[PDB]
Amino acid sequence: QVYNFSSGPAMLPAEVLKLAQQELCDWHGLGTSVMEISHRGKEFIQVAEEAEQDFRALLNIPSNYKVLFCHGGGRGQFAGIPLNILGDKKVADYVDAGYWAASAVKEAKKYCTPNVIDAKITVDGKRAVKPMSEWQLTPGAAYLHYCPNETIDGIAIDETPNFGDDVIVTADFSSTILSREIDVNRFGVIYAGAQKNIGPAGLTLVIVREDLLGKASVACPSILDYTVLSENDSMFNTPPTFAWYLAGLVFKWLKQQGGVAAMDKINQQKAELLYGVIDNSGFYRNDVAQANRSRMNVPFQLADSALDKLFLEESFAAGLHALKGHRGMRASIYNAMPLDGVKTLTDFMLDFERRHG
Amino acid sequence: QVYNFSSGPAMLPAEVLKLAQQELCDWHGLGTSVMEISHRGKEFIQVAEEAEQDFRALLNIPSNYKVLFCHGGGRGQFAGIPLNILGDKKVADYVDAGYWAASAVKEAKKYCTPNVIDAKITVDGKRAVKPMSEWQLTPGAAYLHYCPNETIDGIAIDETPNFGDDVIVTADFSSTILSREIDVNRFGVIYAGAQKNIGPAGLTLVIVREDLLGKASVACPSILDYTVLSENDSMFNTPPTFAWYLAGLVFKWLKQQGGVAAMDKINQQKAELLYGVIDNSGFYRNDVAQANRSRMNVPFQLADSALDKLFLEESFAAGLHALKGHRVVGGMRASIYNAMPLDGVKTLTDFMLDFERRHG
Numbered sequence: 001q002v003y004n005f006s007s008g009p010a011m012l013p014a015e016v017l018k019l020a021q022q023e024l025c026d027w028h029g030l031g032t033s034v035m036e037i038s039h040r041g042k043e044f045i046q047v048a049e050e051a052e053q054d055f056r057a058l059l060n061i062p063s064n065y066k067v068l069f070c071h072g073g074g075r076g077q078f079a080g081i082p083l084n085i086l087g088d089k090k091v092a093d094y095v096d097a098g099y100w101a102a103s104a105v106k107e108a109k110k111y112c113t114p115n116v117i118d119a120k121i122t123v124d125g126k127r128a129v130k131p132m133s134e135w136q137l138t139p140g141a142a143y144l145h146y147c148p149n150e151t152i153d154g155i156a157i158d159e160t161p162n163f164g165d166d167v168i169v170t171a172d173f174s175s176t177i178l179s180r181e182i183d184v185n186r187f188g189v190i191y192a193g194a195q196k197n198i199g200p201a202g203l204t205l206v207i208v209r210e211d212l213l214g215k216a217s218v219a220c221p222s223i224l225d226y227t228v229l230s231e232n233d234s235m236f237n238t239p240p241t242f243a244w245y246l247a248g249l250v251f252k253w254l255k256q257q258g259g260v261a262a263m264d265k266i267n268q269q270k271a272e273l274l275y276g277v278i279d280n281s282g283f284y285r286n287d288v289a290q291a292n293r294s295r296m297n298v299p300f301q302l303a304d305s306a307l308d309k310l311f312l313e314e315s316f317a318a319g320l321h322a323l324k325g326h327r328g329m330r331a332s333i334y335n336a337m338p339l340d341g342v343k344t345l346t347d348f349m350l351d352f353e354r355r356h357g
Numbered sequence: 358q359v360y361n362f363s364s365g366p367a368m369l370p371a372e373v374l375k376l377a378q379q380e381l382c383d384w385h386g387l388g389t390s391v392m393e394i395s396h397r398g399k400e401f402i403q404v405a406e407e408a409e410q411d412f413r414a415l416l417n418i419p420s421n422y423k424v425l426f427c428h429g430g431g432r433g434q435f436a437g438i439p440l441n442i443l444g445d446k447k448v449a450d451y452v453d454a455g456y457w458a459a460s461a462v463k464e465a466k467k468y469c470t471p472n473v474i475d476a477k478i479t480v481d482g483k484r485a486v487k488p489m490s491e492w493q494l495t496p497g498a499a500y501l502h503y504c505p506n507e508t509i510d511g512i513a514i515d516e517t518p519n520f521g522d523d524v525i526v527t528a529d530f531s532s533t534i535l536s537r538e539i540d541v542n543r544f545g546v547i548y549a550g551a552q553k554n555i556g557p558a559g560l561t562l563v564i565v566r567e568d569l570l571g572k573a574s575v576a577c578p579s580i581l582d583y584t585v586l587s588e589n590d591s592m593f594n595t596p597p598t599f600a601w602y603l604a605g606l607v608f609k610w611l612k613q614q615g616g617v618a619a620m621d622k623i624n625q626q627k628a629e630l631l632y633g634v635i636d637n638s639g640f641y642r643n644d645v646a647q648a649n650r651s652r653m654n655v656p657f658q659l660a661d662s663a664l665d666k667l668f669l670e671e672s673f674a675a676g677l678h679a680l681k682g683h684r685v686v687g688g689m690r691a692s693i694y695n696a697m698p699l700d701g702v703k704t705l706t707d708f709m710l711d712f713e714r715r716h717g
């Protein structure tokens with residue numbers, strides 16, 4: 001058995017990939033693939049609408065939000081957010097406590113002069129994030145942007161936004177959407193590249209509060225314009241139809257598992273197991289503060305990084321793929337990753353420490 | 358046997374889909390799918406590089422062009438072209454002789470003042486396109502844009518651009534790329550949504566002459582910025598990795614067929630067969646001029662359109678899918694792309710003749 005810890009593109013649920021394989025050439029008895037049919041045909045429209053409704057149900061998205069299936073990836077929305085909801089405003093607040101939050105800032109500078117909030121703090125030697133109650137917002141800012149799960153850094157911000165009605169909260173949920181219940185009503189825009197917990201790469205989900213439509217910049221490409229996308233139910237142009245179908249299968253799989261609250265419980269067990277092994281070891285280390293430890297992306301370093309290459313070759317040979325971190329290691333343990341995959345990983349880690357520590 | 362005449366997403370080569378199915382869960386002995394691996398790993402980089410190399414070989418793309426594997430579809434490039442190569446200019450020439458060319462004009466108005474060249478003409482009762490010599494270009498225009506294959510209208514502009522060095526030709530090849538050999542050197546930008554002759558939907562190909570880089574608008578999203586995309590080998594961000602892999606398989610399949618010259622000959626046979634049946638029947642009609650008839654998208658109307666529904670029900674039951682014409686014009690439309698075998702067009706035309714016999 002191969003367990004794939006890639007952060008993105010990530011593993012699909014094994015049952016989903018098996019189903020997609022079974023019907024790849026002849027889908028629902030049509031004699032063609034789901035990827036070969038018109039997006040404006042009755043058959044694909046049903047796939048698309050069921051995927052939208054399942055996503056709405058899984059997250060308990062209120063009726064005053066649009067759910068858009070978009071091209072361009074997470075970095076597409078780094079441009080899409082300011083291009084759609086700056087309106088006539090020239091400032092937005094961006095919270096930076098990690099790589100992807102900082103990347104969003106860089107793109108936003110094409111469109112406005114962002115106010116950057118440095119939310120990084122060190123608490124008892126551990127990397128943490130300032131509480132939202134301390135974020136100094138700009139009166140009148142068009143929106144606030146933050147990243148609740150920093151994929152490379154292993155840093156999560158779990159607290160629910162509770163800002164005034166004048167604050168429009170936007171958030172990059174790429175590497176954590178569907179891993180726990182969230183209060184969608186507290187947000188203006190939630191977006192996620194699909195290639196962590198939704199589907200394959202090439203698809204992005206955007207949840208947009210409906211009153212934010214209607215003020216896109218004229219410069220916004222129509223394929224990224226939330227108002228045009230909503231008008232056309234995400235079929236302004238040809239969608240990534242196979243990716244949208246696969247996302248729909250993932251949503252069906254999540255329903256079969258018991259939904260996001262069921263995932264939340266298994267993800268807690270997976271994270272406690274892996275962080276427990278790291279913390280009870282002098283050979284592995286993670287220095288993110290407990291309250292900000294991501295349950296989805298778990299970086300860790302070896303006490304002797306001269307062993308990194310051997311760790312990667314031997315873990316791969318043991319069927320544990322894609323553990324390399326950014327310029328130590330990073331285990332991504334998304335919804336699709338079973339607890340048995342994390343047990344296999346930690347057993348390997350304990351053995352590797354016995355050998356080389 | 359099912360023949361799928363969808364205009365986009367379109368049929369893939371059956372051999373390509375069968376291979377993708379076989380290796381969907383365990384790709385190249387990895388025990389994972391090609392869609393579950395990092396785009397920056399050595400395995401996917403090889404897929405990506407071979408796909409680029411194979412596309413360059415198939416179309417004879419010169420080395421002074423970049424080949425970009427992009428997000429956003431054909432309509433993404435309706436914005437991407439002006440956002441990348443207007444530079445400091447405000448005028449570009451747009452040729453309108455069909456639905457997709459007109460759609461490109463509409464998007465262009467967000468970014469510039471297009472000079473719209475109406476190239477539609479009627480000759481002897483048939484819809485045709487003005488010769489390129491009648492296209493009144495604007496001195497100083499940043500570029501010229503046209504659509505050599507109008508997917509809804511069945512109108513092809515096959516004539517080779519022969520403009521001077523000061524004209525930057527850009528062209529929407531979505532529904533015809535790889536169907537015949539073309540002279541890439543005559544163009545500044547060639548683009549194509551993948552979901553007709555390249556791969557599945559979710560991927561777009563852009564061929565851009567290298568001297569046109571470096572003048573993108575600051576407003577261009579980085580994911581659409583040709584300079585950023587080229588600098589990062591189309592991996593500025595996460596690619597549509599499964600679509601890129603499948604495109605790579607299509608390119609290998611095209612090589613196995615004999616390449617674009619081989620497909621050109623088969624596509625000519627397919628189009629001559631289908632247009633002959635339409636022309637020699639009083640029951641079906643197509644009113645596009647011979648010189649502008651697409652070989653890829655063949656619209657036709659029934660003499661009695663009250664039989665449209667029955668034609669669609671009976672063709673579907675005969676294994677002939679997706680023949681309804683676009684909602685903007687009605688009628689029927691047979692899309693007969695590279696993947697469609699001659700036997701599929703023979704099955705379609707035999708059906709059309711039998712339908713006329715039974716109901717005409």
Ligand SMILES: Cc1ncc(COP(=O)(O)O)c(C=O)c1O
Pocket residue numbers: 008072073074075076100147149150151172173174175193594595596
């Ligand atoms: C939090 C976060 N933001 C942004 C991205 C970038 O996504 P993409 O490659 O789709 O642009 C990723 C992962 O890919 C991510 O995890």
Ligand SMILES: Cc1ncc(COP(=O)(O)O)c(C=O)c1O
Pocket residue numbers: 237238239365429430431432433457504506507508529530531532550
């Ligand atoms: C000539 C042409 N241009 C543009 C498009 C639109 O492309 P997309 O739906 O990928 O934006 C199509 C087909 O979809 C096409 O055939």
